[PDB]
Enzyme design. Sequence first.
Site, PDB file in Angstrom:
ATOM      1  N   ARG A  46       0.952  -1.177  -0.034  1.00 30.07           N
ATOM      2  CA  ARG A  46       0.008   0.040  -0.103  1.00 30.07           C
ATOM      3  C   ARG A  46       1.004   1.214  -0.007  1.00 30.07           C
ATOM      4  O   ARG A  46       1.560   1.597   1.002  1.00 30.07           O
ATOM      5  CB  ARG A  46      -0.951  -0.165   1.296  1.00 30.07           C
ATOM      6  CG  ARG A  46      -1.640   1.127   1.115  1.00 30.07           C
ATOM      7  CD  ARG A  46      -2.514   1.223   2.469  1.00 30.07           C
ATOM      8  NE  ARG A  46      -3.662   0.184   2.458  1.00 30.07           N
ATOM      9  CZ  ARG A  46      -4.338  -0.319   3.397  1.00 30.07           C
ATOM     10  NH1 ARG A  46      -3.925   0.011   4.746  1.00 30.07           N
ATOM     11  NH2 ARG A  46      -5.304  -1.245   3.464  1.00 30.07           N
TER      12      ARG A  46
ATOM     13  N   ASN B  44      -1.537  -1.370  12.261  1.00 27.41           N
ATOM     14  CA  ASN B  44      -2.610  -2.288  13.084  1.00 27.41           C
ATOM     15  C   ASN B  44      -3.980  -2.288  12.831  1.00 27.41           C
ATOM     16  O   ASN B  44      -4.170  -1.562  11.713  1.00 27.41           O
ATOM     17  CB  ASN B  44      -2.448  -1.728  14.785  1.00 27.41           C
ATOM     18  CG  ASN B  44      -2.890  -0.350  14.950  1.00 27.41           C
ATOM     19  OD1 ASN B  44      -4.292   0.073  14.448  1.00 27.41           O
ATOM     20  ND2 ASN B  44      -2.127   0.450  15.442  1.00 27.41           N
TER      21      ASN B  44
ATOM     22  N   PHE C   8       4.493   1.167   8.424  1.00 25.65           N
ATOM     23  CA  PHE C   8       4.745   2.204   7.455  1.00 25.65           C
ATOM     24  C   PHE C   8       5.636   3.304   7.550  1.00 25.65           C
ATOM     25  O   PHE C   8       6.098   3.317   8.943  1.00 25.65           O
ATOM     26  CB  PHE C   8       3.256   2.954   7.532  1.00 25.65           C
ATOM     27  CG  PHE C   8       2.718   3.674   8.451  1.00 25.65           C
ATOM     28  CD1 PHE C   8       2.200   2.991   9.882  1.00 25.65           C
ATOM     29  CD2 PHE C   8       2.789   5.055   8.677  1.00 25.65           C
ATOM     30  CE1 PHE C   8       1.801   3.693  10.725  1.00 25.65           C
ATOM     31  CE2 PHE C   8       2.212   5.951   9.722  1.00 25.65           C
ATOM     32  CZ  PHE C   8       1.919   5.103  10.856  1.00 25.65           C
TER      33      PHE C   8
ATOM     34  N   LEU D 274      -2.544  10.216  13.550  1.00 22.34           N
ATOM     35  CA  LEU D 274      -2.086   8.871  13.921  1.00 22.34           C
ATOM     36  C   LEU D 274      -1.658   8.732  15.374  1.00 22.34           C
ATOM     37  O   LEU D 274      -1.610   7.837  15.867  1.00 22.34           O
ATOM     38  CB  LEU D 274      -1.203   8.335  12.765  1.00 22.34           C
ATOM     39  CG  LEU D 274      -1.851   8.243  11.530  1.00 22.34           C
ATOM     40  CD1 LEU D 274      -0.834   7.685  10.389  1.00 22.34           C
ATOM     41  CD2 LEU D 274      -3.240   7.295  11.391  1.00 22.34           C
TER      42      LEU D 274
ATOM     43  N   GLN E 241       3.573   1.545   2.983  1.00 19.71           N
ATOM     44  CA  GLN E 241       2.953   0.406   3.894  1.00 19.71           C
ATOM     45  C   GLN E 241       3.625  -0.780   3.471  1.00 19.71           C
ATOM     46  O   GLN E 241       3.367  -1.164   2.395  1.00 19.71           O
ATOM     47  CB  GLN E 241       1.921   0.559   4.363  1.00 19.71           C
ATOM     48  CG  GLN E 241       1.353  -0.506   5.331  1.00 19.71           C
ATOM     49  CD  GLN E 241      -0.327  -0.450   5.865  1.00 19.71           C
ATOM     50  OE1 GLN E 241      -0.687   0.876   5.575  1.00 19.71           O
ATOM     51  NE2 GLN E 241      -0.884  -1.440   6.234  1.00 19.71           N
TER      52      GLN E 241
ATOM     53  N   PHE F 203       1.187  10.604   1.588  1.00 15.50           N
ATOM     54  CA  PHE F 203       1.040  10.087   3.150  1.00 15.50           C
ATOM     55  C   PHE F 203       2.194   8.914   3.617  1.00 15.50           C
ATOM     56  O   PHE F 203       2.727   9.267   4.503  1.00 15.50           O
ATOM     57  CB  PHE F 203      -0.536   9.583   3.276  1.00 15.50           C
ATOM     58  CG  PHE F 203      -1.336  10.664   2.988  1.00 15.50           C
ATOM     59  CD1 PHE F 203      -1.738  11.452   3.971  1.00 15.50           C
ATOM     60  CD2 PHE F 203      -2.068  10.812   1.684  1.00 15.50           C
ATOM     61  CE1 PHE F 203      -2.901  12.499   3.925  1.00 15.50           C
ATOM     62  CE2 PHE F 203      -3.149  11.602   1.680  1.00 15.50           C
ATOM     63  CZ  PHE F 203      -3.439  12.591   2.559  1.00 15.50           C
TER      64      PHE F 203
ATOM     65  N   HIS G  19      -0.838   4.631  16.462  1.00 17.53           N
ATOM     66  CA  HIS G  19       0.009   3.827  16.166  1.00 17.53           C
ATOM     67  C   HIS G  19       1.447   3.989  16.793  1.00 17.53           C
ATOM     68  O   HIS G  19       1.511   5.256  16.952  1.00 17.53           O
ATOM     69  CB  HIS G  19       0.256   4.051  14.328  1.00 17.53           C
ATOM     70  CG  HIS G  19      -1.084   3.764  13.710  1.00 17.53           C
ATOM     71  ND1 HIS G  19      -1.345   2.602  13.127  1.00 17.53           N
ATOM     72  CD2 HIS G  19      -2.174   4.667  13.434  1.00 17.53           C
ATOM     73  CE1 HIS G  19      -2.458   2.638  12.428  1.00 17.53           C
ATOM     74  NE2 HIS G  19      -2.944   3.908  12.967  1.00 17.53           N
TER      75      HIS G  19
HETATM   76  C1  LIG Z   1     -11.046   8.575   3.929  1.00 19.65           C
HETATM   77  C2  LIG Z   1     -10.120   7.890   3.097  1.00 19.65           C
HETATM   78  N1  LIG Z   1      -8.827   7.341   3.840  1.00 19.65           N
HETATM   79  C3  LIG Z   1      -7.569   8.319   4.164  1.00 19.65           C
HETATM   80  C4  LIG Z   1      -7.208   9.766   3.514  1.00 19.65           C
HETATM   81  C5  LIG Z   1      -7.473  10.780   4.530  1.00 19.65           C
HETATM   82  C6  LIG Z   1      -6.985  12.013   3.994  1.00 19.65           C
HETATM   83  N2  LIG Z   1      -6.937  13.140   4.996  1.00 19.65           N
HETATM   84  C7  LIG Z   1      -6.829  14.309   4.387  1.00 19.65           C
HETATM   85  C8  LIG Z   1      -6.980  15.442   5.583  1.00 19.65           C
HETATM   86  N3  LIG Z   1      -6.108  15.302   6.647  1.00 19.65           N
HETATM   87  C9  LIG Z   1      -6.029  16.188   7.869  1.00 19.65           C
HETATM   88  C10 LIG Z   1      -6.545  14.153   7.358  1.00 19.65           C
HETATM   89  C11 LIG Z   1      -6.738  12.775   6.466  1.00 19.65           C
HETATM   90  C12 LIG Z   1      -6.913  12.176   2.732  1.00 19.65           C
HETATM   91  N4  LIG Z   1      -6.850  11.172   1.779  1.00 19.65           N
HETATM   92  C13 LIG Z   1      -7.216  10.073   2.236  1.00 19.65           C
HETATM   93  C14 LIG Z   1      -7.371   8.778   1.050  1.00 19.65           C
HETATM   94  C15 LIG Z   1      -6.091   9.041   0.085  1.00 19.65           C
HETATM   95  O1  LIG Z   1      -8.349   9.092   0.423  1.00 19.65           O
HETATM   96  C16 LIG Z   1      -8.825   7.688  -0.268  1.00 19.65           C
HETATM   97  C17 LIG Z   1      -6.869   7.648   4.896  1.00 19.65           C
HETATM   98  C18 LIG Z   1      -7.496   6.172   5.224  1.00 19.65           C
HETATM   99  C19 LIG Z   1      -7.256   5.269   5.872  1.00 19.65           C
HETATM  100  C20 LIG Z   1      -8.019   4.286   6.106  1.00 19.65           C
HETATM  101  C21 LIG Z   1      -9.117   4.287   5.363  1.00 19.65           C
HETATM  102  C22 LIG Z   1      -9.536   5.419   4.504  1.00 19.65           C
HETATM  103  C23 LIG Z   1      -8.544   6.411   4.507  1.00 19.65           C
HETATM  104  C24 LIG Z   1      -7.850   3.005   6.754  1.00 19.65           C
HETATM  105  C25 LIG Z   1      -8.247   1.890   7.001  1.00 19.65           C
HETATM  106  S1  LIG Z   1      -7.233   0.480   7.536  1.00 19.65           S
HETATM  107  C26 LIG Z   1      -6.358   1.924   8.259  1.00 19.65           C
HETATM  108  N5  LIG Z   1      -6.555   3.139   7.632  1.00 19.65           N
HETATM  109  C27 LIG Z   1      -5.280   1.496   9.315  1.00 19.65           C
HETATM  110  C28 LIG Z   1      -4.125   0.737   8.508  1.00 19.65           C
HETATM  111  N6  LIG Z   1      -4.565  -0.869   9.045  1.00 19.65           N
HETATM  112  C29 LIG Z   1      -4.255  -1.718   8.240  1.00 19.65           C
HETATM  113  O2  LIG Z   1      -3.787  -1.602   7.297  1.00 19.65           O
HETATM  114  C30 LIG Z   1      -4.329  -3.126   8.775  1.00 19.65           C
HETATM  115  C31 LIG Z   1      -4.307  -4.285   8.084  1.00 19.65           C
HETATM  116  C32 LIG Z   1      -2.838  -3.916   8.738  1.00 19.65           C
HETATM  117  C33 LIG Z   1      -2.526  -4.956   9.974  1.00 19.65           C
HETATM  118  C34 LIG Z   1      -2.741   1.134   9.042  1.00 19.65           C
HETATM  119  O3  LIG Z   1      -2.256   0.462  10.035  1.00 19.65           O
HETATM  120  N7  LIG Z   1      -2.183   1.912   8.321  1.00 19.65           N
HETATM  121  C35 LIG Z   1      -0.803   2.561   8.559  1.00 19.65           C
HETATM  122  C36 LIG Z   1      -1.196   4.112   8.902  1.00 19.65           C
HETATM  123  C37 LIG Z   1      -1.744   4.654   7.685  1.00 19.65           C
HETATM  124  C38 LIG Z   1      -2.873   3.856   7.193  1.00 19.65           C
HETATM  125  N8  LIG Z   1      -2.827   2.447   7.056  1.00 19.65           N
HETATM  126  C39 LIG Z   1      -3.527   4.169   6.042  1.00 19.65           C
HETATM  127  O4  LIG Z   1      -3.469   3.619   4.791  1.00 19.65           O
HETATM  128  O5  LIG Z   1      -3.840   5.498   5.821  1.00 19.65           O
HETATM  129  C40 LIG Z   1      -4.075   6.232   4.482  1.00 19.65           C
HETATM  130  C41 LIG Z   1      -4.212   7.610   4.643  1.00 19.65           C
HETATM  131  C42 LIG Z   1      -4.275   8.352   3.208  1.00 19.65           C
HETATM  132  C43 LIG Z   1      -3.307   8.255   5.428  1.00 19.65           C
HETATM  133  C44 LIG Z   1      -5.418   7.855   5.328  1.00 19.65           C
END
Ligand code: A1AHB
Lengths: 169, 164
Positions: B54, B101, B112, B121, B62, B59, B125
């Site tokens: 990922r 997590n 990540f 976060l 991962q 951002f 995390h």
């Molecule tokens: C709204 C759309 N969206 C968004 C998002 C958020 C913004 N913001 C704009 C304004 N600012 C101030 C706030 C945020 C903008 N654009 C988007 C995205 C690009 O629009 C599509 C995120 C996100 C994360 C999850 C679901 C939906 C989500 C999610 C779903 S599971 C999760 N996180 C946690 C993830 N567990 C797993 O994998 C588990 C399976 C393993 C063991 C996990 O430990 N890590 C590590 C840390 C990062 C996280 N993954 C991840 O991938 O974060 C993606 C990120 C883009 C950073 C945040």
Amino acid sequence: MTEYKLVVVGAGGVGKSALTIQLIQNHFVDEYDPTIEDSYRKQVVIDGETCLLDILDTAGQEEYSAMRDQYMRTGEGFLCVFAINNSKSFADINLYREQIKRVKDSDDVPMVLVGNKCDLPTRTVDTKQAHELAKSYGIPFIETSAKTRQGVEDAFYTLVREIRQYRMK
Amino acid sequence: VNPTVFFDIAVDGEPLGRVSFELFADKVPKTAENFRALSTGEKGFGYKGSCFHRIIPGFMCQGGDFTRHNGTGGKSIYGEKFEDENFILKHTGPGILSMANAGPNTNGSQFFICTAKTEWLDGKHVVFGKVKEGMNIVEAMERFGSRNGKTSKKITIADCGQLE
Ligand SMILES: CCn1c(-c2cc(N3CCN(C)CC3)cnc2[C@H](C)OC)c2c3cc(ccc31)-c1csc(n1)C[C@H](NC(=O)[C@H]1C[C@@H]1C)C(=O)N1CCC[C@H](N1)C(=O)OCC(C)(C)C2
Ligand SMILES: Nc1nc2c(ncn2[C@@H]2O[C@H](COP(=O)(O)OP(=O)(O)NP(=O)(O)O)[C@@H](O)[C@H]2O)c(=O)[nH]1
Ligand SMILES: [Mg+2]
């Protein structure tokens, strides 16, 4: 061919992706793969007419509730999913419905209430309570299992019918 | 003295370069030690040959699922999961190394690397290291990511280990 824009919403872990992948790929696996955002396409014959379904599988991750407005503007109909063994996920439903109503500025949004994981014996959400909520919204309620496929086609096809009716208004 | 580990990153099998990390064993010793051991492979399993599944430009990158290679797996040296050690360190900007997590106390092997500050976060995390050398390699890995994180080439850890 008419193209229907469906959006699947609900709290983390209720089975939104498992439901969608059962419909699209005829497959279930028990693994947890939390969603960022996924899109699928499937053509189906509903009531003797071929339909093209564009399905948006959204994230239940609670921290990003303020990031839903764009996809609610774009979607035509909504599958509002809770899990029958997770009472919090059922309470979250109203939060989702209010959000869709605000963003679309309307009380008449095509919508189906879905109670998933009905294959499980550890029910904490009474079926009558969910029927009553759906009746108060004026929308259909369908119990599903992504594991056994019970009600999966019915839920998505019902939502298509709700949009079909809406489009003729 | 905090340990140092490296990843040699490949893109579709071709070398891209080496990223190295300081692991903050002084603040998060259990979490640092899990990552260190998985990087050397000394328990008989670990990060070598696994992919970054990922990558979301703007951002993070991962990875760390070496058991299922689909983003659902991974395991720690303590069992499938272990508890959040502490949340002392924050997601302050690019280069931060932190555990993925699935809710409280579900650390395994997935991790990540931030490419921006990800303050929301904090407290959810466990931060346990940071990029020491080769941050521009991580920036280069963002070229193969996408809005929902699906990668356009296979980004792999072709080799990893501990630096003396
Ligand atoms: C709204 C759309 N969206 C968004 C998002 C958020 C913004 N913001 C704009 C304004 N600012 C101030 C706030 C945020 C903008 N654009 C988007 C995205 C690009 O629009 C599509 C995120 C996100 C994360 C999850 C679901 C939906 C989500 C999610 C779903 S599971 C999760 N996180 C946690 C993830 N567990 C797993 O994998 C588990 C399976 C393993 C063991 C996990 O430990 N890590 C590590 C840390 C990062 C996280 N993954 C991840 O991938 O974060 C993606 C990120 C883009 C950073 C945040
Ligand atoms: N027994 C049973 N398990 C189910 C059912 N639907 C989903 N699951 C399981 O519940 C877990 C979560 O499913 P998943 O579809 O990822 O949920 P989600 O709503 O997409 N989660 P997210 O919002 O994080 O993307 C998985 O372990 C999955 O196998 C069902 O109908 N029955
Ligand atoms: Mg999902």
